């Protein structure tokens, strides 16, 4: 019966909780009771990038650690040169309600999306000197929240409906559709090996997917509100999440569980962006109370504060070589810290 | 102290800044407003009339119209799910929200009031005014005159209600219709005056879908909202 199946599922649900308790033997805080504290980290603004006309929602770094792309709700993508603060390209968009941006690892393409239900791919290297739309991807029934490249002919997108998709750019179709969420999906993070990814949705749950099969291997719970940002530790065996309950958490893929909670009583506002440093020792988070914040990823102590923005921080990224951190806000400014 | 190639890169970056300064003028001279409503509410016909004058899963539609040489952009979200709490945050800089509600349902009216309450008490939609259209007044007048279905079996407070002294009846309409149409308006205003705090306001209007004056009403109402902001910006209150 339907009730019996639910009872069977509940009995099956009780089994999972037993396994988690058995493997728990200690805490990360306990094992980190001897490592010397990092201390205090002073970040100072090096560059301020002016030019956008409205709120800034998205930002991605290039692989060369010098070029940068940003999106605003005025209809513009600007490609910057971080070292010189001069503008390389300015791409006008067909829709103006943009919410995501991406930069291809090769360096040829950029992508954008938003409330128009469409992921658009631009070609930055043509025989002529202008940027053109190479492909418009359609097939989602809800707003796009994140998009990430895998190579020049594959991309992964997450949308308002509880689904994520893998696309073939040349053809224009959906190779695999990932289903199993019950709420709006808000983020994606590709693993360094580019064979797994994690999504966090507005149902207090995060899931792990296999790109070449289409199945969900693990489900991670523990939050209480919406999850807005997710990222991998630079090893492929851990990921961090930010939510609207003013907390961040760290999970482990091989011993599925929670390890640390990054919370403090002075702050009540939610988290809007999460990233790691190159070594995995610093975890940076952006907040709704107009300032960014820096955490130590093994002791849960606030190490530093970045405070230079007059409105909320929306995007945050760390370069590949680890020499800079860029933050965008709703004051129409990008700031590079070092 | 700069090379020939690096000197020509700055010149390119200055022909971009010029074009981005010609777009700040158009952006600042155009007003953006968001249209909200239900399925039974006739928000589509208002779009048709305002466009007639002055992809299959697309989720946003835009309409241009100008009155007295000021440009207006109207946005209608069409293909998104029922949950709303996440994409409203993108609309915290618009001039106004137009909330179009049917007045002849009498059974879906309660669900309309709860929807208005959530928009008014949102954390991101403060300092944003609402221009509500009490649509479909032609159908409402017929229903009350025939007297087949009463307005007292869904709101018991109707019997104790009397027409306010500040009324303004149209020429030649049954006072029963006037009493009915002002009761529905007062339900929506009870929500507005509970938590306004003077940061944003609610502008009522009675409309029919065929009316050609809807464009003028928005223009008059917007002219008040920008005025109110300028008194704060220029330090007068």
């Amino acid at each position, epitope marked *: 019966e339907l009730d019996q199946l639910r009872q069977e599922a509940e009995q099956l649900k009780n089994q999972i909780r037993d396994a988690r308790k058995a493997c728990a033997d200690a805490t990360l805080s306990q094992i980190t009771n001897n490592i010397d504290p990092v201390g205090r980290i002073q970040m100072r603004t090096r560059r301020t990038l002016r030019g956008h006309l409205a709120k800034i929602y998205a930002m991605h770094w290039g692989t060369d650690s010098r070029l940068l792309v940003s999106a605003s709700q005025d209809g513009k993508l600007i490609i910057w040169d971080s070292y010189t603060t001069n503008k390389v390209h300015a791409i006008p968009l067909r829709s103006s309600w943009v919410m995501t941006c991406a930069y291809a690892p090769s360096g040829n393409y950029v992508a954008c999306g938003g409330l128009d239900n469409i992921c658009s791919i631009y070609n930055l290297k043509t*025989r002529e*000197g*202008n940027v053109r739309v190479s492909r418009e991807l359609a097939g989602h029934t809800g707003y796009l929240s994140c998009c990430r490249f895998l190579d020049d002919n594959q991309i992964v997108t997450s949308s308002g409906d509880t689904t994520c998709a893998l696309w073939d750019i040349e053809t224009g179709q959906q190779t695999t559709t990932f289903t199993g969420h019950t709420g709006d999906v808000m983020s994606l993070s590709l693993a360094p090996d580019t064979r797994l990814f994690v999504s966090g949705a507005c149902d207090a749950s995060a899931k792990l997917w296999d790109v070449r099969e289409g199945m969900c291997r693990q489900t991670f719970t523990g939050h209480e509100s919406d999850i807005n940002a997710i990222c991998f530790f630079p090893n492929g065996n851990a990921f961090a999440t930010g939510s609207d309950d003013a907390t961040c958490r760290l999970f482990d893929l091989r011993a599925d569980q929670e390890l640390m909670t990054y919370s403090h009583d002075n702050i009540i506002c939610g988290i809007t962006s999460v990233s790691f440093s190159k070594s995995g020792r610093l975890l940076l988070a952006g907040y709704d109370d107009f300032n960014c914040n820096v955490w130590d990823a093994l002791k849960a102590d606030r190490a530093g504060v970045l405070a230079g923005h007059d409105n909320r921080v929306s995007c945050l990224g760390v370069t590949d070589d680890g020499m800079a951190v860029a933050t965008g806000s709703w004051d129409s400014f990008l700031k590079i810290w070092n | 102290t700069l090379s*020939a*190639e690096d000197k*020509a*890169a700055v*010149e*390119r970056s200055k022909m971009i800044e010029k074009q981005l300064q010609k777009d700040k003028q158009v952006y600042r001279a155009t007003h953006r407003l968001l249209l909200l409503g239900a399925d039974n509410s006739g928000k589509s016909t208002i779009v048709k009339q305002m466009r007639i004058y002055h992809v299959k899963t697309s989720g946003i539609f835009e309409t241009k119209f100008q009155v007295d040489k000021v440009n207006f952009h109207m946005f209608d979200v069409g293909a998104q799910r029922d949950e709303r709490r996440k994409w409203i945050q993108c609309f915290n800089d618009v001039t106004a929200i137009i909330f179009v509600v049917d007045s002849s349902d009498y059974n879906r009216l309660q669900e309309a009031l709860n929807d208005f309450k959530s928009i008014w008490n949102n954390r991101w939609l403060r300092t944003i005014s609402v221009i509500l259209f009490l649509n479909k007044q032609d159908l409402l007048a017929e229903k009350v005159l025939a007297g087949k279905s009463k307005i007292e079996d869904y709101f018991p407070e109707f019997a104790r209600y009397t027409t306010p002294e500040d009324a303004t009846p149209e020429p030649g309409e049954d006072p029963r219709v006037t009493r009915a149409k002002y009761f529905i308006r007062d339900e929506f205003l009870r929500i507005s005056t509970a938590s306004g705090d003077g940061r944003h306001y609610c502008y009522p209007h009675f409309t029919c879908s065929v009316d050609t004056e809807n464009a003028r009403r928005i223009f008059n109402d917007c002219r008040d909202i920008i005025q109110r902001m300028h008194l704060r910006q220029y330090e007068l209150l």
Partner: single-chain antibody
Framework: VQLVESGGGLVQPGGSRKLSCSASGFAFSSFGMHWVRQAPEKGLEWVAYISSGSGTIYYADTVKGRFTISRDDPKNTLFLQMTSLRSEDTAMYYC??????????????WGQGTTLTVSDIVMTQTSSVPVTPGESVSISCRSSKSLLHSNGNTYLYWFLQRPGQSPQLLIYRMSNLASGVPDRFSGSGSGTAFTLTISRLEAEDVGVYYCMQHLEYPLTFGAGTKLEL
């Protein structure tokens, strides 16, 4: 893309003529353009340069005062004005396309050229080399000043001219390989010492080679190294 130019002819001494190049197939308004000329049996020499937006105009030493350059963006044509011609102005003039931003490749496309007849970081190059298919050639040209700027990139460019054709780009900034050229071509060197290496030589790549500098104006070319089969 295509660039076709016209205006050449016979011009009596002390006269004047106008040259125009028509552009079709690319974003003309966002591209600066140059002018180069070639004597009847000699190398290349730079003439003028008009930038995007017409905010930067440079002329060569043997050019200032006599020649005037201009462009017409909406009509997609640029004009060169010639006044008081002499006997040293007999050459075939070329129009060259160039853009400048991070990672750009200037001097990409070269036109067919127009014929006209009338009635400083010096670059030294080597004048011939025998060519047998399968061998590996090495062409070297030296410079009178270091081309390695402080930013970190060297401004040396390599060009190739097959018989009866316009020059084509091979290598830009001494290490980068042009778009559309085979991977056998390679370039390397240091300050004031450059070399171009070709591995596994095949037919249809014999001709003259040129090396150009771009650290500061005016741009200086080389005599030309000829490979014959």
């Amino acid at each position: 893309v295509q660039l076709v130019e016209s205006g050449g002819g016979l011009v009596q001494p002390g006269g004047s003529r106008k040259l125009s190049c028509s552009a079709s197939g690319f974003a003309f308004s966002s591209f600066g353009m140059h002018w180069v000329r070639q004597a009847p049996e000699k190398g290349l020499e730079w003439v003028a340069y008009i930038s995007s937006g017409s905010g930067t105009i440079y002329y060569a030493d043997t050019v200032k005062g006599r020649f005037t350059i201009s462009r017409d963006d909406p009509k997609n044509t640029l004009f060169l004005q010639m006044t008081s011609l002499r006997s040293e102005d007999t050459a075939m003039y070329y129009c060259v396309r160039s853009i400048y931003y991070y990672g750009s490749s200037p001097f990409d496309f070269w036109g067919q050229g127009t014929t006209l007849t009338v009635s400083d970081i010096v670059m030294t190059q080597t004048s011939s080399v025998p060519v047998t298919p399968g061998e590996s050639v090495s062409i070297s040209c030296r410079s009178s000043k270091s081309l390695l700027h402080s930013n970190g990139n060297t401004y040396l460019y390599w060009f190739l001219q097959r018989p009866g054709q316009s020059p084509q780009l091979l290598i830009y900034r001494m290490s980068n390989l042009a778009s559309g050229v085979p991977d056998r071509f390679s370039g390397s060197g240091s300050g004031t010492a450059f070399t171009l290496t070709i591995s596994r030589l095949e037919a249809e790549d014999v001709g003259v080679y040129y090396c150009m500098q771009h650290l500061e104006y005016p741009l200086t070319f080389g005599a030309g190294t000829k490979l014959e089969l």
